[PDB]
DNA sequence: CATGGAATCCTTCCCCC
DNA sequence: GGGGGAAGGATTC
């Protein structure tokens, strides 16, 4: 079992560099403008020239400007990045029938057949990086190992523009040496819960009664960490299928006024439908981001598919249910359609 | 100050043999 | 007691 993970470098920003090479070498910040006030919004991502100074995904645009007032600030163009991503996925396809597209810039390839060992896997890695750089002029990081998780960890250690194999020998030393937090699927909240139980490295998950772990982080997450710690984790590479499509936008001013909100809501529904394209959902959920950044949602599943008129109609009742049961003002409003026929 | 899409898993019901 | 689902939320990438 040999898995090869591919991760495109500072992707959105690198695509902007490819489309305007004069940007290369300069700090580039791709941002999502929320239109509330001058430069309100967050950074979707930045190239390494910008990251070396603290500008990265998640910080407020305003804060990035105080640090790199002279960098190049660009509005995110998801659509353009999606199309460049697709072309890249199709390149990888020619290297394996078994491929899992995990996100817009992450993909796992099950090359258990194509290759016979890590050397031939590595060489296939270089061949892929080179093919993608030549065809699309986009640099990527390849991670190679026994399963998906270590393949990903491999890439994280080797970025940017790297390639790395984590052989069975290192897998074991990592199970003992690797900080539990650097394990995929372990965010801040779960890392903390684990600290309290005294688990700082994967192996530590064995010196704890399972049921106590289950109680603390849940069974699914418990079984997950244990199988990795025992070097027995092995989920197959499968193509994932879209299960929900939705869109959430930001209002210029927080509100509680139904008529002031509807517009942004219908706007989200429209965009969501244009994207559903031929797909018919039986479920709808209205999502609201409260003024204190909390997330509330009300939804309903129908016994048949939802027409756009039914969506408009039903979404307003759900938004009203939200306002009725929560007294806080709304900052962001949106919808999500799921359970496709 | 703090955008945004989406999967999966966890609880709490609820209907019902 | 437990299958079968739907809701609302927690958590992660
Ligand atoms: N907070 C965010 N808001 C919007 N888009 C985001 C956000 N965080 C990440 N993205 C995008 C950023 C990337 O272009 C793409 C994710 O890849 P990651 O974010 O994993 O890598 P990156 O390509 O920006 O970093 P790296 O230098 O490791 O390649 O998802
Ligand atoms: Ca990346
Ligand atoms: Ca990635
Ligand atoms: Ca982490």
Question: Span A244-336: which CATH code?
Answer: 3.30.1490.100
What is the Cα–Cα distance from A104 to A108, expressed in whole angstroms? 12
Q: For chain A, give every residue range classified as CATH 3.30.1490.100.
A: 244-336
- Three-state DSSP state, A58: coil
- HSE-up (13 A, CA, CB side) for residue A174: 20
Instruction: Tell me the CA distances in angstroms from A207 to A82, A199, A201, A203, A296, one per residue in order.
Output: 44, 9, 11, 8, 38
Q: What determination technique applies here?
A: X-ray
Tokens for A77, please give them: 């163009």
- Three-state DSSP state, A116: coil
Scan residues 20-49 of chain A and list those with Cβ within 7 Å of strand B: 32, 34, 36-37, 40-42, 44
Pick one of 3.30.420.40, 3.40.640.10, 3.40.1170.60, 3.30.930.10 as the CATH number of A11-77: 3.40.1170.60
Pocket test for ligand 1, best of A6, A8, A11 (most atoms within 8 A of CB): A11
Residue A164 is given by DSSP the state E
A168 is in an annotated binding site: no
Nearest one of A99, A137, A101 to A9, comparing CA atoms: A137
For residue A179, give the ligand nearest its CA.
4
Q: Which long-range contacts (CB under 8 A, 24 or more apart) does A89-96 make?
A: A91/A128, A91/A131, A91/A132, A91/A135, A91/A136, A92/A6, A92/A128, A95/A124, A95/A128
8 Å CB contact between A272 and A244? no
Question: Burial of A5 by CB count in 10 Å (0-12 exposed, 13-18 middle, 19+ buried)?
Answer: buried
8 Å CB contact between A223 and A234? no
A182 is in an annotated binding site: no
Q: A167-233 domain in CATH 1.10.10.60?
A: no
Q: For chain A, give every residue range classified as CATH 3.40.1170.60.
A: 11-77
Distance, Å, A28 CA → B12 C1': 47
Q: Is the peptide bond prior to A160 cis by the omega test (within 30 degrees of 0)?
A: yes
Q: For chain A, give every residue range classified as CATH 3.30.70.270.
A: 2-10+78-166
Q: For chain A, give every residue range classified as CATH 1.10.150.20.
A: 167-233
CA angle A175, A178, A181 (to 5 degrees): 115
Q: Which CATH architecture best describes the domain A2-10+78-166?
A: 2-Layer Sandwich (3.30)
Q: Choose, from A94, A106, A309, A327, the residue flagged as catalytic.
A: A106
Using the mean position of ligand 1's atoms as its centre, give its distance from the Cα of residue A169 in Å: 31
A103 CB-near residues (< 8 Å, 6+ apart):
none
CA-CA-CA-CA dihedral for A307, A311, A314, A316, to nearest 10: -150
């Amino acid at each position: 079992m040999i898995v090869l993970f591919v991760d495109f470098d500072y992707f959105y920003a690198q695509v902007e560099e490819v489309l305007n090479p004069s940007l290369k070498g300069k700090p580039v910040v791709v941002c999502v403008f929320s239109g509330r006030f001058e430069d309100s919004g967050a950074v979707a991502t930045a190239n390494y020239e910008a990251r070396k100074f603290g500008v990265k995904a998640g910080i407020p645009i305003v804060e990035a400007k105080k640090i790199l007032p002279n960098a190049v600030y660009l509005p995110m163009r998801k659509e353009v990045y999606q199309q460049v991503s697709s072309r890249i996925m199709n390149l990888l396809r020619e290297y394996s029938e078994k491929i899992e597209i995990a996100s817009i810039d992450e993909a796992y390839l099950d090359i258990s057949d194509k290759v016979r060992d890590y050397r031939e896997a590595y060489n296939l890695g270089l061949e892929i990086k080179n093919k993608i750089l030549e065809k699309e002029k986009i640099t990527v990081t390849v991670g190679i190992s026994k399963n998906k998780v270590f393949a990903k960890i491999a890439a994280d250690m080797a970025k940017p523009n790297g390639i790395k194999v984590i052989d069975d020998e290192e897998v074991k030393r990592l199970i003992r040496e690797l900080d539990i937090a650097d394990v995929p699927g372990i965010g801040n909240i779960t890392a903390e819960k684990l600290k309290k139980l005294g688990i700082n490295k994967l192996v530590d998950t064995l010196s704890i009664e399972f049921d106590k772990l289950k109680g603390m982080i849940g069974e699914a997450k418990a079984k997950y960490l244990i199988s990795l710690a025992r070097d027995e984790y092995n989920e197959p590479i499968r193509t994932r299928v879209r299960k929900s499509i939705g869109r959430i936008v930001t209002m210029k001013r927080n509100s509680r006024n139904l008529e002031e909100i509807k517009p942004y809501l219908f706007r989200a529904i429209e965009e969501s439908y244009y994207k559903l394209d031929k797909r018919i959902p039986k479920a709808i959920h209205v999502v609201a981001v409260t003024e204190d950044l909390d997330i509330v949602s009300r939804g309903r599943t129908f016994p048949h598919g939802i027409s756009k008129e039914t969506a408009y109609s039903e979404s307003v009742k759900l938004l009203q249910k939200i306002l009725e049961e929560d007294e806080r003002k709304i900052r962001r409003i949106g919808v999500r359609f799921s359970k496709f026929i």
